[PDB]
Structures are given as structure tokens and as C-alpha cells.
Design goal:
Glutamate receptor ionotropic, kainate 2, 2 domains, D-Maltodextrin-Binding Protein, domain 2, membrane protein, alpha/beta, four-stranded mixed beta sheet, binds ligand NDZ, three-stranded parallel beta sheet, two domains, monomer, globular, 13 strands, 19% strand, monomeric, ligand-binding
């Protein structure tokens, strides 16, 4: 029937739409990814319902029991037909789900307060006073966990040794720690752009640590993946994706 689309709350990609009049169905949400989903639905001819991922996670594999979680696991378990969210396309996820071509490109970087001598991941990694970390079970944490690059392997050893104290459960928690304590938050450049424009005391530190894209996730072998890619390429070529980014970041 209608497709079930899982997502996760992350400003400005997906928000609860605030309104005085009761809101119903898909109108309860808004954001760049909500606009994307709508365009996908009219281009390809489907109807849908939005569900918030139940365990509140993007998706990582638990290496004690091999189990994936988050939106990734919902796709694996066929609890959702699509995942439409700021969902990073990654090699490890590609082994268990499929992605469309990217609708946005980005990289990991560092969010920290302005007016300090910290300039690079290296400045963070070579010291143990300033804490740093990422959202638990997200692709940024997983990048550090998998890295063979010495600066990032060292950073992961640090984060992992202090996991409960330095990994946070959300973007908002990470940002609040930066605003209030001696903390640097590893996060994606697209989201950094949004945050720094609204918190004038915050800044990106250094450049991009990797390069990746966000894509729409599907269960592996889904006939929707290639169709979604065709729709995304059309929105890109016509300038619609760029217009949506302007709408939600400006
Ligand atoms: N986009 C990530 C999830 C996450 C991240 O790991 O960087 C968590 C949350 O962290 C802050 C900022 O990167 C935001 O875009 C979110 O992205 C993913 O697909 O898992």
C-alpha cells in the first residue's frame, strides 16, 4: 500500500512542524528531508507514512552481538520501505542495506567554541585535558572506531576509554556541551553550517576529516533504490536540491 518511511529528528532535516491547528499524517513533520520525501513521492507516484525510528538511533553494529540498530536495522528487518534522513552513505552500511545516489555531500569536522588555540584534530588528539566525542551509534563515531589513520585511531582510543562521559545521545546534547564545558564535538559539516549560523560563539575547527554523502536508504535489493536515484538526479539537475538547502539553511 503506502510506503513506510523511517526518519529521525535532526534540525533542519526533520522537525516536528509547530502549529496552532491540529496537524495530521505527514503534515506533522517538516524539514529539508521532509520536502525531499514529498518530491520523491510525486515524481515516482507513491503514497507514504512517516515513522520516527524507534530506538532513536541512526545505525551502527554492536560488535558484541553483531546486531545493527537504528534506521539501518529497521530497513534490514523490513519495518520500513525507505529511510529518508541525514543518513550517511558508508561502506559498512552498504554491506547490509542499499542507498540511492547522494542528495547532499559533506564531511566530518570539529565544532568548538571561538577564541581558542585549537586548530585541528591533531591539536585535540595530542592532549588529554579538552574532551571530545560524537553522537553514539552514528556514522561519525563509526568513522573514528574504524580508522587506521593514527591521529583518528588515537582519538578513538581516547573516546572509547571515556565512552560514557564523551559520547552524547544527540546533536543538541553535543552542542550544549560545547557551549558550557571544555568540549569539542565531532559532527558533519552540513550540520555545522546550520549550527554556527545560529550560535555566534561556535565555530568549525580545521577542515573536513573525510568526504561522504547523505542518501536514501532501502532494504537490500529493493526495487525502489534505482527509482529513488533517478528522482534525486532530476531534482539535482533542475536546481531543486540547491533551492531546498537554501530554504532550510538560510
Ligand atoms: N549522519 C550520521 C549521524 C550523525 C553523525 O554521526 O554525525 C549523528 C548526529 O551528529 C551531529 C551531526 O553530525 C548530525 O548531522 C548527526 O549526524 C549518520 O548517518 O549516522
Amino acid at each position: 500500500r503506502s510506503l513506510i518511511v523511517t526518519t529521525i529528528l535532526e534540525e533542519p532535516y526533520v522537525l516536528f512542524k509547530k502549529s496552532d491547528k491540529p496537524l495530521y499524517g505527514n503534515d506533522r513533520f517538516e524539514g529539508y528531508c521532509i520536502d525531499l520525501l514529498r518530491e520523491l513521492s510525486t515524481i515516482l507516484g507513491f503514497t507514504y507514512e512517516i515513522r520516527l525510528v524507534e530506538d532513536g538511533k541512526y545505525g551502527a553494529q554492536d560488535d558484541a552481538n553483531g546486531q545493527w540498530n537504528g534506521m539501518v536495522r529497521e530497513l534490514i528487518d523490513h519495518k520500513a520501505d525507505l529511510a529518508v534522513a541525514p543518513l550517511a552513505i558508508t561502506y559498512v552500511r552498504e554491506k547490509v542495506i542499499d542507498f540511492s545516489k547522494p542528495f547532499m555531500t559533506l564531511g566530518i569536522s570539529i565544532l568548538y567554541r571561538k577564541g581558542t588555540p585549537i586548530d585541528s584534530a591533531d591539536d585535540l588528539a595530542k592532549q588529554t585535558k579538552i574532551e571530545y566525542g560524537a553522537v553514539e551509534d552514528g556514522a561519525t563515531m563509526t568513522f573514528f572506531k574504524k580508522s587506521k589513520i593514527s591521529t583518528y585511531d588515537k582519538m578513538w582510543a581516547f573516546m572509547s576509554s571515556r565512552r560514557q562521559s564523551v559520547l552524547v545521545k544527540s546533536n543538541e546534547e553535543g552542542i550544549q556541551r560545547v557551549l558550557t564545558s571544555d568540549y569539542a564535538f565531532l559532527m558533519e559539516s552540513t550540520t555545522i553550517e546550520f549550527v554556527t549560523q545560529r550560535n555566534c560563539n561556535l565555530t568549525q575547527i580545521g577542515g573536513l576529516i573525510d568526504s561522504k554523502g547523505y542518501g536514501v536508504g532501502t532494504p537490500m535489493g529493493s526495487p525502489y533504490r534505482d527509482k529513488i536515484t533517478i528522482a534525486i538526479l532530476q531534482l539535482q539537475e533542475e536546481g531543486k536540491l540547491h533551492m531546498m538547502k537554501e530554504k532550510w539553511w538560510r
